Short mmCIF file of C-alpha atoms in Angstrom, two decimals:
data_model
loop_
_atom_site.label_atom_id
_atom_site.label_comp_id
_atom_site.label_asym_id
_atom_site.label_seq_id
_atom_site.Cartn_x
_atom_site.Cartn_y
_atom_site.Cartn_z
CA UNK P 1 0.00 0.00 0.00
CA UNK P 2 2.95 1.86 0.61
CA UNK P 3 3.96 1.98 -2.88
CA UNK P 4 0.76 2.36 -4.00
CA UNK P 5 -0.13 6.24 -5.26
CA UNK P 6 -3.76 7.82 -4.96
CA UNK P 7 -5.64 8.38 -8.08
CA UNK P 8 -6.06 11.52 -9.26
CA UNK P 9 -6.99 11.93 -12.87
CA UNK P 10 -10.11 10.73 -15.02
CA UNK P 11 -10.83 10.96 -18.34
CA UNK P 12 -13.49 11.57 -20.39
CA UNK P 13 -15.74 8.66 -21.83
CA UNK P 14 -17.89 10.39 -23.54
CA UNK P 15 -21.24 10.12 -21.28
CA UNK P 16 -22.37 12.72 -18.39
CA UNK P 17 -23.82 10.03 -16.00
CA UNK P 18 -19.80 8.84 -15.02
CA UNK P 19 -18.95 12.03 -16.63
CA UNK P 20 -20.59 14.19 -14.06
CA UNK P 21 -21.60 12.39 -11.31
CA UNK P 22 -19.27 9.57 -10.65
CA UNK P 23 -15.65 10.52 -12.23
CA UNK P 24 -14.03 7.97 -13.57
CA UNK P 25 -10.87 8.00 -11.87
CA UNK P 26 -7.71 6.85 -14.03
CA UNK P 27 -6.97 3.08 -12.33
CA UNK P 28 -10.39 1.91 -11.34
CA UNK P 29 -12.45 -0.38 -9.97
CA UNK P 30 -15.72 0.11 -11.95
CA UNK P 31 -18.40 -2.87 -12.08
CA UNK P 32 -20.85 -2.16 -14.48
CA UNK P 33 -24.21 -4.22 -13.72
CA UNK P 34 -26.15 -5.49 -16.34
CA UNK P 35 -28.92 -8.11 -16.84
CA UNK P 36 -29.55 -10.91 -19.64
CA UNK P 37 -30.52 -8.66 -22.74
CA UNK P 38 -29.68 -5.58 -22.65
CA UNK P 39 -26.95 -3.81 -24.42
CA UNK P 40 -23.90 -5.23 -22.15
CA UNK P 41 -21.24 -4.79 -24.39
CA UNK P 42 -22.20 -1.69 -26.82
CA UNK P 43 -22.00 0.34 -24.11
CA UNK P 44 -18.96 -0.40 -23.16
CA UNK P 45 -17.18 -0.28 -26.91
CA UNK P 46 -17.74 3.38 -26.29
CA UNK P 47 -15.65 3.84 -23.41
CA UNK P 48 -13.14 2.61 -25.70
CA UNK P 49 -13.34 4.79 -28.42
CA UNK P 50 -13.70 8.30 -26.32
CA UNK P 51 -11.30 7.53 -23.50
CA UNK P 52 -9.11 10.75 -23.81
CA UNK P 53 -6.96 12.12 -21.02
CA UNK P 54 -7.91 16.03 -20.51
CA UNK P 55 -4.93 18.29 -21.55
CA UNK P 56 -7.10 21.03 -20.64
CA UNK P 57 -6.81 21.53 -17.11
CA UNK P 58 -3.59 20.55 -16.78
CA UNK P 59 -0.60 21.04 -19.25
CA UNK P 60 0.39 17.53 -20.30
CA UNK P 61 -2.07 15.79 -23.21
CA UNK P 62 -1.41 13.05 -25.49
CA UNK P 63 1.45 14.80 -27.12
CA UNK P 64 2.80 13.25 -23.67
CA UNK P 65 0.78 10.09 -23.88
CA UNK P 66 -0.41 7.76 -26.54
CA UNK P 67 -3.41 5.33 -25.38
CA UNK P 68 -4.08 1.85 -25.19
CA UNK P 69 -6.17 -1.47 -24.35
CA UNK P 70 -6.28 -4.70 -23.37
CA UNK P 71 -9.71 -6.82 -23.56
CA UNK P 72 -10.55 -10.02 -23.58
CA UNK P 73 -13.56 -12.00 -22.60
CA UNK P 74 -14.06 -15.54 -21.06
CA UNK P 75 -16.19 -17.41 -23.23
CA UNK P 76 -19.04 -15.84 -25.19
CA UNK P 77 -21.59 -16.22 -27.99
CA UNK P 78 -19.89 -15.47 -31.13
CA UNK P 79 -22.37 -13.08 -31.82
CA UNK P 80 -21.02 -11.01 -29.63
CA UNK P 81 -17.48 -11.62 -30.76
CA UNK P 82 -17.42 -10.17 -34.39
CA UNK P 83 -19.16 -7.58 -32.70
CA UNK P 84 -16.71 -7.03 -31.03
CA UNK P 85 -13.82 -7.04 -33.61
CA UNK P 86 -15.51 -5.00 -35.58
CA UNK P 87 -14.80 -1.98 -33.25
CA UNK P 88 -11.46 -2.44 -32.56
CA UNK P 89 -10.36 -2.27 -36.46
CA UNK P 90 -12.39 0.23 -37.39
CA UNK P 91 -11.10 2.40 -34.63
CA UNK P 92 -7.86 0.72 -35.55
CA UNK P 93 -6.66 0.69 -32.04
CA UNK P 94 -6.55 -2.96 -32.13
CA UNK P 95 -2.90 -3.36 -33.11
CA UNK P 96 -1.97 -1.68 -29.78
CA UNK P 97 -3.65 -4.53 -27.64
CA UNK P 98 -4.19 -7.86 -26.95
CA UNK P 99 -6.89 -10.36 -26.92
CA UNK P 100 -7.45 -13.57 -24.85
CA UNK P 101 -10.17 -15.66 -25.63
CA UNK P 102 -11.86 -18.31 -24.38
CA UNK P 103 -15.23 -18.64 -26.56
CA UNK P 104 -18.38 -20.38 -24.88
CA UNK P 105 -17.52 -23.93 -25.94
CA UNK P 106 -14.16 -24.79 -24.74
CA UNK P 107 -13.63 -27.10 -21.80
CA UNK P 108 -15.18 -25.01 -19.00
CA UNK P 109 -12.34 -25.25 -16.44
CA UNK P 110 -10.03 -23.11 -18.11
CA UNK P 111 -12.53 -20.37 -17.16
CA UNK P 112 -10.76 -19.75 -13.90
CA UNK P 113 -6.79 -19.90 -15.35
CA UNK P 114 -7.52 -17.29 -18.36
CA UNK P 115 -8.45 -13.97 -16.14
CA UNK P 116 -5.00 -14.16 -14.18
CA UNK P 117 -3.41 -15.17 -17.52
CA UNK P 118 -4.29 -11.71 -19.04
CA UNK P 119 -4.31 -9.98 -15.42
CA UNK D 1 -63.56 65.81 -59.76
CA UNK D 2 -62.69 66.35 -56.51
CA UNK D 3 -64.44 62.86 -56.07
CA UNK D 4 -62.01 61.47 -58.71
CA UNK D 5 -58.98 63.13 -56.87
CA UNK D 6 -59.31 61.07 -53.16
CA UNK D 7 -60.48 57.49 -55.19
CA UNK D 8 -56.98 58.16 -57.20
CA UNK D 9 -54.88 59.05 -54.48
CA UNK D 10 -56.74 56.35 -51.89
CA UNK D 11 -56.10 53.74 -55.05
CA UNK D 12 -52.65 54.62 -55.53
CA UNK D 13 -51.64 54.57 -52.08
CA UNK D 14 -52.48 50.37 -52.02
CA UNK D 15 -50.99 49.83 -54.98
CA UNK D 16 -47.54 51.19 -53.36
CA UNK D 17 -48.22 48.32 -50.83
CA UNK D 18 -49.03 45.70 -53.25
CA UNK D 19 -45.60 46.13 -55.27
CA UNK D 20 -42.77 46.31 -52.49
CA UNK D 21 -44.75 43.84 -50.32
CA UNK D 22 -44.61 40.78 -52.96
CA UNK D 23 -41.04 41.51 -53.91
CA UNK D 24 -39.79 41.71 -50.23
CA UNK D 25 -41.35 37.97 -50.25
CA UNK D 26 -39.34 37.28 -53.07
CA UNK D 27 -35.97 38.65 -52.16
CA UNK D 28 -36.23 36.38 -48.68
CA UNK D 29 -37.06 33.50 -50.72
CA UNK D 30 -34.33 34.02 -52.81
CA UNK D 31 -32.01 34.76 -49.45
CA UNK D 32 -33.56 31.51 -47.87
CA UNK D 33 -32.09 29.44 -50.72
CA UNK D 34 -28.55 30.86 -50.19
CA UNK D 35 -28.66 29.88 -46.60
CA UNK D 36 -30.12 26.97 -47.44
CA UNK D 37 -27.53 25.38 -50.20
CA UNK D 38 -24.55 26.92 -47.81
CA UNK D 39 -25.41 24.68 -44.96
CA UNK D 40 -25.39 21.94 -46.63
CA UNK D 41 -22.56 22.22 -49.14
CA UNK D 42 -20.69 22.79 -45.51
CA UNK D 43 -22.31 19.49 -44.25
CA UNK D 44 -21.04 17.46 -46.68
CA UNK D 45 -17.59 18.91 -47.14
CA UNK D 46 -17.40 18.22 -43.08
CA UNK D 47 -18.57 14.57 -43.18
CA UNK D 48 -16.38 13.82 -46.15
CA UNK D 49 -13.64 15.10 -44.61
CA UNK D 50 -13.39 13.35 -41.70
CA UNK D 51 -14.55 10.28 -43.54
CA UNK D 52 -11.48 10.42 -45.63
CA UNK D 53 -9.00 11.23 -42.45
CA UNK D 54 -10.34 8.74 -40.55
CA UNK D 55 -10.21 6.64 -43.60
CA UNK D 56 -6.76 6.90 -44.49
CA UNK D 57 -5.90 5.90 -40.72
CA UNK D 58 -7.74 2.59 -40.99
CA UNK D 59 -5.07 1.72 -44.16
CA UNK D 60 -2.44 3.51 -42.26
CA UNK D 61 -3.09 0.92 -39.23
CA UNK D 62 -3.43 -1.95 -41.87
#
């Protein structure tokens, strides 16, 4: 804990409800709660497109950082894969990340090595 | 006479109203148009633009 450093900057994603209310904090924690059926993972492709450090109030931007990500999943429908690929190309900030990937179908135990693996 | 002096002049008066008031209506449809094609000759040089930016980074990444 010692060598651990409070938080102190947030970005912008891109939607007042963090973006007002709730701050997202550079090095979080957040759980977002969902349910069966409802737009899970849309929501948060967009997080990943307009999370942007804020120059603005400070002096240092991106001309002093470049930006990056790191995603994978566990197992899903493969609907919801291409989905997902789809984003990250188009953006194009796929080469700067990596993807694990466990898809819904593989033997089931190897469900609780693959988040440390990436981790 | 005097009778056909005021139905002249009363006449005449209107007919000053008549003229400028249609062409008024004219000149701002005319001005309407302007604005009109502007905004949108901007809107499509803005989403083109980006488009073609953006574009060129997606090959750029390839």
């Amino acid at each position: 804990p010692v060598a651990r450093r409070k938080p102190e900057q947030f970005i912008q994603t891109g939607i007042s409800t963090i973006d007002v209310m709730n701050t997202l904090v550079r090095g979080q924690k957040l759980p977002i709660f969902s349910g069966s059926g409802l737009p899970a993972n849309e929501i948060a492709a967009q997080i990943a497109r307009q999370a942007t450090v804020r120059p603005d109030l400070s002096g240092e931007g991106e001309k002093e950082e470049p930006f990056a990500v790191v995603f994978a999943a566990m197992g899903i429908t493969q609907r919801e894969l291409s989905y997902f690929i789809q984003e990250f190309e188009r953006t194009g900030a796929l080469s700067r990340s990596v993807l694990f990937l466990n898809k819904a179908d593989d033997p089931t135990i190897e469900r609780i090595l693959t988040p440390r693996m990436a981790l | 006479s005097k009778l056909e002096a005021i139905l002249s002049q009363e006449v005449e008066a209107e007919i000053q109203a008549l003229l400028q008031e249609a062409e008024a209506k004219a000149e701002a449809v005319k001005r309407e148009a302007e604005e009109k094609a502007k905004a949108l000759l901007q809107a499509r040089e803005r989403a083109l633009e980006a488009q073609y930016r953006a574009a060129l980074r997606r090959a750029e990444s390839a």
